[PDB]
């Protein structure tokens, strides 16, 4: 298998929980390990955009989620945004990549700053400490100079600043298939094979 | 009348041709003027992308668009890239806002650093110089840390990065409504009325 | 197989055409697919320094080079310019590593500044947002401040500079020993096998 | 085998002996090749602190570290503080993995600015040059502003800081568990196999 | 009385609980007033590591500690996460030391930002505004450059950033000892008198 | 007692030996205790300049220096360069202000980059971790911008950089007095009493 | 003949009135011409200081000078604080090196600042900006950050900061001799001839 | 003569003896009086990497090389690393150029840092202090950003930074010609003459 075993996919308080939810589904095909954390923010999100009811508590969510994604039993796994026993919370835990999608302009800062007032902010810190992979996937417009260096900061770290910014060279027929553009290359930037978005140029041999 | 009366659209060879073309309707829409600029690769992306068949002669492309837009006689203006004669050219000119939609991110490059290579990078130099409106419209994803130094540099001058990220709070039904989002936003930067995104909270009172 | 599958092999205007062929040769019998791009300038100085005649359009350039390297059917895939459609000019393209060998100080300014104004600019844009490996050989004496301070830029953000600046260490005869230096210590960067350049102190156990 | 097959470490004059021993004993018993470098000033920290009677010069160290750790013939190679006959002083050499440890502030400095005053100085200039793992333990209490500008140049390098500053979380009783937190944490870096720290929350579900 | 009257000693989320005891313990030997704050995580990091039973709620927890330490009538006083009425709340307030031991890498993002989300990140802030005693004592391995800015922010104001780093020159035979080794270095930092860690080579008169 | 009770006074290879030496006469009849650290560029100084036959090895350094000034039996401490086993070399040794007078421009740099290659080095840095008093006397012209670097991130540090720039202001008659000048300002700056430099305006009541 | 023809020579408030009149008086013999600014602080100085009388206003200061060294007709210029009239206040002046001999630390701070608040500091400013010799010679004891970061910035920039810290290792016997070091390394600085300071080992064949 | 009369070359630890001998051959043949350093490390190099049986002790060096070269008398001058008593030691000698061919890694760290080890480092402090010509050659590959920084801050400071990275622009047939262009460079900075590398271009008139 190509690409991580293991995810965690923390949800934070920005439009797009499309992006989320999707990646979450795709990771579950691939037969992965997901570790899911959603914010109060997100939650909200998820609410406003989607049709999506998700449960509050962590139980029930793990639940819902295992259901909405076909998955196998404790493929996902749910913690709450104090549980400091769960696997994130500490670098001694098992290596897993780390993505946030959505990420909101709070959450960039909060990981650009080092904050950890929740386990996604501390996932995050975890993740640069021991080196693991972090992709963070902002939604916003504008954005400010404070969003502008708190991204860079990051990604000169070796953080990835992968904006929802879809592409429209693939055809594109729905807002589907403009969230699967945003979701393939979160995959393609952990490793993890999809096959939503073609390889460019790869049949072109010469000119 | 509210906003700029002038506007030097600029479409550079980022995926993304089609807010560049519904952000040219609706500025005629709302009777302004518009300096249409468009690089050799925005060509090939309108081409690649769209359904749209562009001429490539200046005069031509003038016709073409004015038909499209439904606009007035004159009303959208088409300058080559070098034309140095050109408005955009020089700080004398009368003032207008710029907008470059989609913004590659060789585009960006140049403006950050002062390249003027050809019309489009120069429009910009003049903007920076007479502090006129500038906004850059950026598709691409990931964004690496040359991206976002570049991007900081000029937001911190008072140009407006402003992704094409759009957000789905408000029921998007449609690749065009998305489109819509992004257009509306630059609308919105611009002073420029627009009726496509809602003033968000506009009704609520307390709580 | 160790190392990268595709390599995208960028040859640009500065002395030291040789360093880039011998490189070509040596990918080729590792069995690597190679994507081949050239620049006006490094032909012209392939045409100065060397006796390779090589042709100036791409598929005769593949051919040439093919017959050059003993290469198999499309095992070198060559692209032009301004070829949009090749898969360097996209992160959505299957990955490779790419080397710049050798890197002119205006290929090295434009990587670090992120001017896009070809395919080979634009192909180490894309490696570098996709993190990727990016290798640069500059050729140039005396360096100045300009240009190692493009060099330390990309060096912190993962970049590997490699200059052309072979060692006599091991007891070289000829020009070639010396070009065979260089690339050694290109392909040990990429993992790629090589039996030009020995381990140092390999049988060293003590002392 | 996961992690490095080779691992040079290198033994400096801070506080600390305890940790290399027994992360050359882990590494040993994980069949890793060690080139071990042992600075003058570390020798006399060894003497100071424990009861590990060293020998001087580096055939007999190499006995009689075979003998301390139980491992195979030439499984340990001991290099002199002016070797540069050894593999660490080349970057031409076979890849490893380094880590300093103890690292004393001076070695750090040395480091982060270039020095190469002895093999270890070297070993480490070629393995941030090579791009190879570098993982350096100081153990110092207060830090000063010297010392942190120094670790920060080389984490943002992609070096590894990792004081010896030992968790409690795991129940230690005596100091040699508090060492092999250390230790443990240093071969998790590495991704070599390590039983002495649970992984974290590895069989926590949910809430 | 050499050092402070007045030390406020807050401890955070990071392990080592024990030092933060320890060092409350020795600061009430020595007759001082303590202003002792504790952050929820701080209060589950004595839980999972120690067998201090540490009530809640402050009056409790007062009694309590008092009990423990074997302290004086209000030599310990308890405030809680808000309790803006007490004195390290305000600069106004008589002059204390502060120390913040365990340290939490969250905690340091907050001081060295300025965020004051609550009194420990307050008292801080003020500690710092008025040029009083600041001691910070983290406990993480790796350090990430996130961290090790936020360290050198606040060392380059005039913090002392002390790791929980313990040294091994002066035979430690307990966990306890070297929880001691870290306590003394602090009270040394206070100019609080100390009797666990001698005074190097404080009878070597030559050599 | 006004100012510290010990010193460490360090001398190393820049002119001016005669400002050392005075320094140390003026300490020892304060009655203070003095670490005396003198390097082998600065003994060579000292025998170009002076007519001082001082001893090479630390006891006979230390019976001469103890006869030159008059000083009380183990009032002048003497170490040598890796004496390890000294006060200076730890930071848990007693508190010690610290002057490095003269101080070459090489000593300047290996303390502003932390080298620690010898004691002198090694107690500068513990100088600054622990916060103690540190001044530095160069003692060299032209100062280049390496020179000026480390002393402009020393000074920002808190350690006082101190030329050996004698005023004229008060009537010198003799090279003597010129060296009185200087030593008068270290004490002045350490708070140990002086009569060798009035105090500027001290009698001026008003104009 | 060896270096400049005409150097501006400022004198400011700094202790020291003896460097910059035994600097006059060699670059008369030397039969260069002199431009010779003083400022109100540098005459209080010059009176304090020494028993040179020196006249307050330019005509009378020239023929004063002219005298005291022995001068020709018109060989020494002076030049009042606003004679914007005068050759150093322009840059369409004949080149001349500048030296500032004492310079004070408000003269410093003028000219890394660009202040230009009367004659000296704007032949300073014109100086540098006409890449013409400025030399700098503070005396202030101790040199704060303030003052350090001046001399960084102007010495990066390429002016020469030439501190009046004399050295030892020319027998001096005298005030003279220090004051006669000082003077030999400015006139050395601007490659004009002097016999006060041999050159350093130029009799040393080997060893 | 064009060019300086005097050069000090310090030949340190990087491959590359053939340059610094070929350049001495050629100073020696323009008549140039040369003050020659070997590093240790460079007398390994030199014995590792060429036939040339260099004495270890100055004179027997010294007239070796005078052999070596063809020099007159007492034109080649050698001292030894702590030779303070040599030219270079002082900025009071009489000026040369200097050039460190090869320039090690850790050489070019101390020149950059003002370490002054030794006595080429002191060399190349003096030269920087007193605005004499520098010229360092590294040899090293890659160059990692700690490098690339030393070489920035010197290249900065007005030193020139020429790797030993021949052009193959004039048809080289040897080892030897690589050798002569890199040679040729130095002398060309220096202002020397050469005939190795002819003037491009000088018969091109027009086109
Ligand atoms: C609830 C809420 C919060 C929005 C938001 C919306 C809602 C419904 C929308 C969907 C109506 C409109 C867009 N929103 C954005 C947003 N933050 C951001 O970076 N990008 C967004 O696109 N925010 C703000 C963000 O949630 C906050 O600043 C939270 O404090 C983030 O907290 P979190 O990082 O813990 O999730
Ligand atoms: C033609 C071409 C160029 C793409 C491109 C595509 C094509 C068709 C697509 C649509 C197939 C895939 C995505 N592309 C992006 C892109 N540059 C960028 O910043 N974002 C993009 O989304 N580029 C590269 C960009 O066009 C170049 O680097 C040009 O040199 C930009 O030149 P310009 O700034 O003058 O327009
Ligand atoms: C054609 C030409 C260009 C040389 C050149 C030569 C020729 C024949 C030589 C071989 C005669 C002499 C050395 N050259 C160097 C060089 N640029 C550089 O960084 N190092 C070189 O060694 N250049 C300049 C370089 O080619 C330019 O600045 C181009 O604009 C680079 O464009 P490119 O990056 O697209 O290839
Ligand atoms: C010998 C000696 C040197 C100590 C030392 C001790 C001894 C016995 C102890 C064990 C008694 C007390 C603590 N020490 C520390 C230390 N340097 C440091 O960063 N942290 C330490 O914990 N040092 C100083 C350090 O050894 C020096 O500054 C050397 O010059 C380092 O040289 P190295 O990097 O080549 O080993
Ligand atoms: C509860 C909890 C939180 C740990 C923690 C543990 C637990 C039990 C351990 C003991 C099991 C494992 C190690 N931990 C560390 C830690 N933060 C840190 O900087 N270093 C630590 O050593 N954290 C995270 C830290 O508590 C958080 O990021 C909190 O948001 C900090 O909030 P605070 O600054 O207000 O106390
Ligand atoms: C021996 C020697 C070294 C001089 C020196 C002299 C001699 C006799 C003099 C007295 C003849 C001329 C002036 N010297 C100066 C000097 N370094 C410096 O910063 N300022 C000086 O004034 N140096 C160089 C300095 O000694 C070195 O660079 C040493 O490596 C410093 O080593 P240290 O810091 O361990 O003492
Ligand atoms: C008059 C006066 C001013 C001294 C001074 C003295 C006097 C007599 C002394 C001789 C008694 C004591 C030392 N002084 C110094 C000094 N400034 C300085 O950088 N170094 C000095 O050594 N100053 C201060 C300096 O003159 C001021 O700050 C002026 O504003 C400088 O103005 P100027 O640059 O236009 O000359
Ligand atoms: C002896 C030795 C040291 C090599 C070396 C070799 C040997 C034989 C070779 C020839 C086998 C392989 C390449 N080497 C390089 C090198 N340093 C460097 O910057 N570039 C080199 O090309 N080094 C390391 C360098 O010598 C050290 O780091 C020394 O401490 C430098 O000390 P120095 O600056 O006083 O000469």
Same mark, same amino acid.
């Given at each position: 298998?190509?690409?991580?075993? /293991? ?20 990771? %579950? ?8 954390? *959603? ?11 989607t ?6 508590? !962590? ?12 998955? &196998?039993?404790?493929? *996902? ?6 549980? =400091?026993?769960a ?5 001694? @835990? &098992? ?5 946030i ?9 909060? %990981? ?9 902010? /501390?996932?995050?810190? %975890? ?10 996937? !902002? ?6 100079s *404070? ?5 860079l900061?990051? @990604?000169?770290?070796?953080? %990835?600043?992968? !904006? ?8 594109p ?8 553009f945003?979701?393939?290359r *979160? ?12 390889? =460019? ?7």
């Amino acid at each position: 298998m190509s690409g991580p075993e /293991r995810i965690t996919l923390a949800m934070t308080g920005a439009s797009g929980a499309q992006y989320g939810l999707r990646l979450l589904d795709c990771l %579950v095909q691939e037969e992965r390990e997901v570790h899911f954390l *959603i914010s109060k923010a997100a939650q909200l999100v998820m609410a406003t955009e989607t049709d999506v009811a998700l449960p509050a508590k !962590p139980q029930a969510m793990q639940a819902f989620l295992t259901e909405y994604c076909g998955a &196998a039993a404790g493929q *996902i796994r749910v913690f709450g945004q104090n549980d =400091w026993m769960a696997p994130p919370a500490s670098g001694s @835990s &098992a290596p897993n990549a780390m993505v946030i999608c959505p990420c909101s302009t709070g959450t960039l800062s909060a %990981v650009a700053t080092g904050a950890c007032n929740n386990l996604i902010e /501390r996932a995050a810190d %975890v993740a640069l400490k021991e080196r693991r992979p972090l992709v963070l996937v !902002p939604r916003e417009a504008p954005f400010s100079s *404070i969003h502008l260096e708190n991204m860079l900061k990051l @990604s000169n770290l070796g953080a %990835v600043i992968l !904006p929802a910014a879809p592409g429209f060279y693939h055809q594109p027929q729905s807002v589907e298939d403009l969230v699967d553009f945003v979701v393939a290359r *979160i995959l393609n930037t952990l490793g993890i094979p999809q096959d939503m978005l073609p390889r =460019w140029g790869e049949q072109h041999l010469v000119s």
